[PDB]
A paper describes a structure:
In oligomeric channels, the pore is lined by the first transmembrane segment (TM1) of each subunit, which forms an inner, of two concentric rings, with the outer ring being constituted by TM2-4, with TM2 and 4 of neighboring subunits engaging in extended interactions. Here, we investigated whether these placental paralogs would form heteromers and characterized heteromeric complexes consisting of CALHM2 and CALHM4 subunits using specific binders as fiducial markers.
Dimerization in CALHM4 proceeds at its intracellular region, resulting in large particles, which expose their extracellular parts at both ends of a tubular assembly. This sample has allowed us to isolate a specific binder, termed SbCALHM4 or short SbC4, that forms a tight complex with the CALHM4 channel pair, which remains intact during size exclusion chromatography as confirmed by SDS-PAGE. When investigated by cryo-EM, we observed two populations of particles either exhibiting D10 or D11 symmetry (corresponding to dimers of decameric and undecameric channels) that closely resemble equivalent structures of CALHM4 determined in previous studies. Between the two populations, the reconstruction of the density with D10 symmetry imposed was of higher resolution and we thus restrict our detailed analysis to this structure. In contrast, TM1 forms an inner ring of helices lining the pore, with the bent helical N-terminus (NH) running perpendicular to the membrane and projecting towards the pore axis. TM1 packs against TM3 of the outer ring but is not involved in direct subunit interactions. In this cryo-EM map, we find the density of sybodies binding at the extracellular side of each subunit forming two rings of binders at both ends of the assembly.
Residue numbers in the entry:
A (entry chain F), B (entry chain E), C (entry chain D), D (entry chain C), E (entry chain G), F (entry chain H), ...: 5 to 82, 94 to 276
Write the structure that this text describes.
């Protein structure tokens, strides 16, 4: 049933779902463990922006780089060959895109990252309580109350209202992002089908050709080197390894020990 | 017994039930985790409408796109051929429809999404407490009390009455939607049977023909490419992989290394 | 022992019991989760009537439609042929009837659905407390107290008495319904036996004939199409798939790639 | 060991015990869940009588109807043939009787059903507290206090005494019923043995003859129809299903597609 | 399935992930157990710097040294040979780098190590509370309050603000470090591909050649020495070990006991 | 899979990790159970020094002695032979060093042993509270407060400060020790590779030669003695043990009983 | 894998570790259960001395006696024979020494046994509180307070100080004992290697010779007696046991019954 399991894995839906589930679980643990939104007035946008974009960028780069087909494409690039390379790049891009989109969607829908990032950019014209002719303390309290200030001094109404505003903006932005991602994925698949010179059956043949040629060469390269080394050590020790050699044995010489080395 | 399990899966009832159960569980977790109905006076209908329709639209698109038969139909379209394509589209539409209908039904029956969406569209003529000659504060409180306002000031009677009204309207709308979906499904199946030119036995033969032809070509395309590459690497290394080659081995040349590449 | 398990399933008693148990469990979860009886004076009968009849109607339609034998009967209909079709319809009707009868029986015996449905149709002549010369407030309170009003103002005695009256009427109606269903089932089986032209042994032979003919044609249609496609692709690639083809291989031409497509 | 398990099931004691245990468990759940004895003065005897007799009648009818041997007997009826049919009817009646007797015994021994049924028929001559010259309020309170009235007004002594009287009468009636059932079962078995024209060994032979003839005809009817349809589809597709057919294949014609249909 | 498991391990992604997970778990236990940040005014930077860099340096050295290929490269070093050695060094550097980068990233993101390290380097110009004309007590309290001082004397506002500043700086530094590590890894892989004289297929052949030659020589060196010693002890005891020797046995002499020793 | 498990054990990393883990667990149990730091003014340095060095010395001696290769080296010692013995000593020293280094590192990092050892050597010039012109009570209290004195008399500030000083010194000393151990291990491995006259492949051959020669001689010494004794007892009892001897049996004589003894 | 398990047991390290672990567990249970240090002024040293030395002496005697090789050595004793007997005695002494050393080490390190043993030998010159011109009550209280006296009368400071003194002395004595035991074991092994006339390989041969000769004689003595008795009873009953004897049977005579007895 292992072969049946492998056939099931050959479908990209299961693997992409598994990657998305791992991203969701990892994001839950990571955010609930080590977020600790700072209260710093000077630089607080960088904290949220890093916590929101850097993991997505890392996951994107990992999804692209960890695929050996991408290294082969880059080696080829560094007519029909161009279209074939573009098709392989698209096939890689499927996973390379499902990897970080889950992170961005989950983080935006939770909204805490976006809140901690864009808290300080809130407006104060609507709220008469934020006059603050000093024009410097207002910025500090604006960047301060989202984090840990608490301190109920009847300003918490404005805090709660603006926090709900930023949470709503975050979740709506997440929905916009996921809708755009889905539309882009569908359009990209349609463009790949339209621009592919190979027919559907020819495309299937070519994909299987690529997979099988790579696997076959790997296996037979292993077997060829095994045979060549086995002949070499047959010369070295007077027998082929793993076979009945009580007939004859060899005594290597020091210069022969140099030759094998 | 794995073959028996596969035969059971071949029935669409089990798979559709599994999809519906996953949709119900996912909706429960998603709604109980990250709903957080906003209190914003300006845009609150968009929040509920997005949370109610966007997941359904995404699930519909996923159900249609993830089926490779749909890509084959679109490739063909892009007499009897038209009817056959329509029949295959209907067979895909079965799953493509069971996927989001569960989401819409569960969300409407729970009613919280519809409440948060259409709270602000409530009438005030019936209730004398909502005179509010200002005609602007009334809209804000109307969009505000459903979310988190609480603040018992004896208006909570009107809040509770209108909340029950919207919940009842939501659940009745859900029942109307599921009844219409069932009627449409039954009528569509009857129309498919009436409009199908193939006989019942001929239809069964054609369906099995399609499945078997696709599977057979996939397998033998794999095997043909395996044989062709195996002959190529037999030329390359002087032996066929996976067989007894102690008779002879090859030493590839650099230009030959270019040819295999 | 899998074959023994299949033989046990061939008895309709186990499958009908399994369907009834699933209906009971689903009704328990559904009602205990999302009933929320409304307090609306205008339309409250529709709520309960929908929650009581719509699931039963959906389950009835599903039981009839999900059976492929029903599609075959409808295709035939759209002498002895009429009686044979009627017998097959009855065999389908067995499951199509056990599916929703469990829902109706459980919902009526619990009585909450019937209470929320027919609360507003209660009489007030017996109770002197419901004079209400206004003749409009009385209807509203009558439709209101069953839901969530509570508000002990010594009218709860009338509320409790009428609630017990409606609960008793609901459970007695459920018993009447289940008794009528059992009597109708027994009479229908007796009428089927009386009206069947086939003898008992002939009826058994005919039933097994139908099942076996459908299964055999499905299997051999699969195998015939497999053989035809296998010959086609033998023409295409110069070999039969899944067999030793190191003797010869083919190089398809583009026009031949068109022919296979 | 599955065959040994089947041999154990062939003994009626285990199956009858299993049916009785299921009846006891189902009665426990059903009564502890949805009894809710009403307080209605007018009709309260019908409630208990239905809850006490209707399930027993349904179980009796199910036990008789679900046995296919009963349908065969009814088909025969609709000399020695009469005695043989009577013997088969008795063999069916064994299970048809053990099915509801458990329900009646358990319900009477618990006594709550009988109490709620025959509460209103209690006498009042013994108790001087029930003078009630009105002669209408007395009936209402008599039918009311058993259900949920509580309301300790020092009449609860009479309530408790009459409740104990009805509980004792219920349990004694249950013992009378089970004793009569056992005596009737033993006498019926003795009468069956006396009136049976077959000898003991001949009776065993006849019972096994009946079982084996029915099973054999079912199996070979299946196999005969399989062979006939297999020959038909051999004509249709030019080969027998499930066998090596690479020698020849057929191309059905539309009129031939009509003939197979 | 053990062979399949080995094939999965052959992918570096799983092993690198396993190493990173072990580093994370070990860091969690180690830091939560035995950190105990000191309060010493004189030397407190050394404590955090050691706890932050020494484990990373040890893990780096272990990753490089524990790989026997590194010992082989160092033995060779102590044209194309240089490039081949550089490629092998890079292949080792992959694991040698994933080993401590996890430690540095986790420790910086947690931030406690960096806080305890660079607490004393905080500025005091911004805070008017830290005038301290003594200019020596200020340094001591600055190095003291992060550790365990507590002692709320309304200076804890400055403590909390500067602690948040250092935590934010630590986490941002961790993000900078991980981004630089990823960029360096990608650039190094690209430079390795560009500078490699071998082709992609030739590179695969060479890697498999190296692995197979080392494994083959290890095995056959074992077998050669086994044969040589077996012949020696055949001389010693008059028979080959592990074979039927009831034909003849030997009695070793003391001088022969010296020869074997 | 047992052979695969043995191959995994052949790697020293797993065994060294297992030894270190056992040392950590044993140290945890031992220290948390039976430390009980004394308060004795006279001799308290000896207690901590013993608890810190004696287990390490015992583990070092056990690691060296328990290896039979060490006994063989000592027997040889008691040109190339010297270098070969040095290489074998180094191979033993690997485990002999990983055994106690874990104990020293864990004990120093915990710091309690070092605190109890070097408490009395603390300075008193910095602290004006320790004037104590008596110059004898001061030493006693200095050696006393670390253990169990408690007794808060506002001197606990000095106690806590000096305890933190000694804990920091202990952990820094542990880091210095582990860094020096790692540097020494790496330098020793490099010196072993540089000073080894054998080539890398020759070194592998020699190591496998040593292991195989020892194992082979052990096995065949067992088999030779088994054969010799078996012949002796064949003389004694007239038959070879474990074979069909119903042909003949012997009756030993008393003088023959002496000869076998 | 049982043979592999036996090979692992053949290493003395595992068995000695198992013996030490059992000694530790048994000591824990025994001491925590039934110590109950007495308060008797007269004889309290004997109690602790017995509880500390008698189990060690018993374990030593058991380790020596339970080994049958020791009985063989004593039988031989009761040139090279002397050295061989000494070597076998040393091999026995390994286990005979690891058996009680664990008990002594654990008991001394816990220190409770030594405290209860040597409490009464404490000095009183240092403590001015123990003047007690009576010179008899002082001894009684000195032997009394360690056990159960409690009775805080401000003398508990001296009690605690002297208890810590004796605990420290006990644990230091335990460390001295274990260090001396390890040094003696290493020196004894070195002396055994130096004084052994056999070479290392000859020593291995001799050890295996001893084990194999004893096992072989045991087995074949069993088989010889089985054959002799089997022939005897073949004479007795006319057949060999466990074989086909339907050919002939015997009827033993009473005098023959005497001969077999």
């Amino acid at each position: 049933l292992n072969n049946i399991v492998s056939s099931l894995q050959r479908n990209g839906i299961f693997i992409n779902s598994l990657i998305a589930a791992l991203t969701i679980g990892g994001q839950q643990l990571f955010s609930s463990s080590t977020f600790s939104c700072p209260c710093q007035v000077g630089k607080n946008f960088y904290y949220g922006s890093a916590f929101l974009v850097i993991p997505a960028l890392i996951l994107l780069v990992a999804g692209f780089a960890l695929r050996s087909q991408m290294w082969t494409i880059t080696g080829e690039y560094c007519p029909l060959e161009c279209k074939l390379a573009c098709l392989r790049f698209f096939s890689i891009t499927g996973r390379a895109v499902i990897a970080p989109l889950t992170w961005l969607a989950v983080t935006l829908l939770t909204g805490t990252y976006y809140e901690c990032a864009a808290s300080e950019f809130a407006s104060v014209d609507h709220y008469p309580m934020f006059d603050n002719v000093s024009a410097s303390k207002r910025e500090e309290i604006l960047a301060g109350f989202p984090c840990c200030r608490s301190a109920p001094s009847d300003v918490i109404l404005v805090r709660d209202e603006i926090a709900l505003l930023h949470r709503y903006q975050s979740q709506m932005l997440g929905w916009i992002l996921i809708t755009l991602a889905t539309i882009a994925a569908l359009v990209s698949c349609c463009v790949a089908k339209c621009c592919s010179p190979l027919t559907s059956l020819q495309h299937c043949y070519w994909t299987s050709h690529l997979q099988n040629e790579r696997e076959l060469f790997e296996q037979a390269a292993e077997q060829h080197s095994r045979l060549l080394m086995m002949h070499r050590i047959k010369k070295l020790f007077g027998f082929i390894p793993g076979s009945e050699d009580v007939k004859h044995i060899r005594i290597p010489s020091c210069q022969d020990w140099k030759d094998i080395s």
